[PDB]
Amino acid sequence: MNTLLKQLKPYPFARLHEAMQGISAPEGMEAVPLHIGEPKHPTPKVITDALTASLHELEKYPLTAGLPELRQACANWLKRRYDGLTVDADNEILPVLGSREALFSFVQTVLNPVGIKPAIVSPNPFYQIYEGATLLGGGEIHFANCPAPSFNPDWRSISEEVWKRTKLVFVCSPNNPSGSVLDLDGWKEVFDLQDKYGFIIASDECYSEIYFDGNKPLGCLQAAAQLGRSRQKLLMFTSLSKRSNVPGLRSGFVAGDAELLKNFLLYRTYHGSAMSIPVQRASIAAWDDEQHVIDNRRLYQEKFERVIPILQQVFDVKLPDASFYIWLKVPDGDDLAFARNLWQKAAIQVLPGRFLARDTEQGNPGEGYVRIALVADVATCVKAAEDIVSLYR
């Protein structure tokens, strides 16, 4: 049982808590939680109205594939969002109970060791789920480092021997933590590798709606369409969590290769991941409405518009491609000391970049950075930015 469970590594939050033990913030000073990776904006009424109005439907077991009208709301949203992209609600979309369970379960189906040990390639810095899902599925995790200035994945670091047994590659776009959006050239590179080696691509696009000034992030399926490529062995994973301020609703979808999804659905019927009908109705309301999403982007953009210039007094920093993070370069390279000093002097919590990345033969690509989330209100973000500058100017 505990053989694979024993290989799991502590979560970033836990590493930060341990690192801060014995370091005291100023007496009476409220902690400023910039280290978190979750939204703080309130849930929109359009979603909660739809949930409440359908609660009688709790009396019914939902089918794993979901209501036709939920799959169609996702197909309609895809068309609006990705400039006419046509994805078949009947064959290319499954609702998921948040992207976390979907990513984990899909990986379990992809990894079936017997035998050559199968590999999965993740960006580095990574999202902890990519590693854990791989370890618990009996796979071997490998890391494509994402160095500045583009923070795109360096696939060349991965040997031919590893590529030959690689069953899946993760892309996170927009990236947590770097904000980077993989562009057409980056997608073409990974598609060329896929033609060579035959792995599945899983693209985690949960930050697709968090962007600035009309500069919409390119998605995987859109990139494929722009390059005239089929959806074979391509899957996008997305969520209402960041888009719609409903991390608690546990609702998203997976879309792409109909052949992959046909078999994933069969598995999911046993894995027990069918969506509550009232949750489906709330989700339809969410995917159908853009006003709450527009309002959401406006809140984030206002924060960056104030915070970036404040931080530029002292730091080498610019607006990220997308997402609500700043991946801040630490001037002397010591992300741990940076976090300690901010906590001791201002009760400000930031996440050391090295806790989001693994050591490699080429170093740890999270060292020298901290992750800051602009999820609190603008006054809180501005005060923090000013306090940080005051400590480093």
Q: What residue ranges bind a copy of itself (CB under 8 A)?
A: 1-6, 8, 10-11, 38-43, 47-48, 51-52, 55-62, 97-98, 100-105, 108-110, 112, 128-129, 132-133, 136, 241, 245-250, 263, 266-267, 269-274, 276-279
Place of tokens 């078999």: 263
Q: How far is the CB of 279 from a copy of itself (least distance, A)?
A: 8
Q: How far is the CB of 190 from a copy of itself (least distance, A)?
A: 20
Q: How many residues bind Ca ion (CB under 5 A)?
A: 3
Q: Output 15 or 271, the one with its CB closest to Ca ion.
A: 271
Tell me the β-bridge partners of 363.
360
Residue pair 212/177 in contact by the 8 Å Cβ criterion: no
Contacts of 318 (CB under 8 A, 6+ apart): 308, 312
Q: Output 55 or 337, the one with its CB closest to a copy of itself.
A: 55
Residue pair 325/374 in contact by the 8 Å Cβ criterion: yes
341 binds, among Ca ion, a copy of itself, none (CB under 5 to 8 A by kind): none
What's the CA angle centered on 102, arms 217 and 140, to 5 degrees? 95
Of 384, 372, 381, which Cα lies nearest the Cα of 346? 384
H or E element that contains 358: none
Q: Output 274 or 319, the one with its CB closest to a copy of itself.
A: 274
Distance CA(356)–CA(347), nearest Å, equals 21
Q: How far is the CB of 88 from a copy of itself (least distance, A)?
A: 21
Q: Output 135 or 317, the one with its CB closest to a copy of itself.
A: 135
47 binds, among a copy of itself, Ca ion, none (CB under 5 to 8 A by kind): a copy of itself
Write the interaction track for Ca ion spanning residues 101-140; mark x where CB under 5 A is met and - where it is not.
Answer: -------x--xx----------------------------
Residue pair 280/266 in contact by the 8 Å Cβ criterion: no
Q: How far is the CB of 220 from Ca ion (least distance, A)?
A: 23
Q: How far is the CB of 388 from a copy of itself (least distance, A)?
A: 26
Query: What is the 8-class DSSP label of residue 148?
Result: T
* Token reading at 169: 């590659």
Q: Output 111 or 285, the one with its CB closest to Ca ion.
A: 111
Residue pair 128/8 in contact by the 8 Å Cβ criterion: no
Q: How far is the CB of 132 from a copy of itself (least distance, A)?
A: 4
Distance CA(124)–CA(100), nearest Å, equals 18
322 binds, among a copy of itself, Ca ion, none (CB under 5 to 8 A by kind): none
CB atoms under 10 Å from CB of 116, counted, come to: 9
Residue ranges in contact with Ca ion by CB under 5 A: 108, 111-112
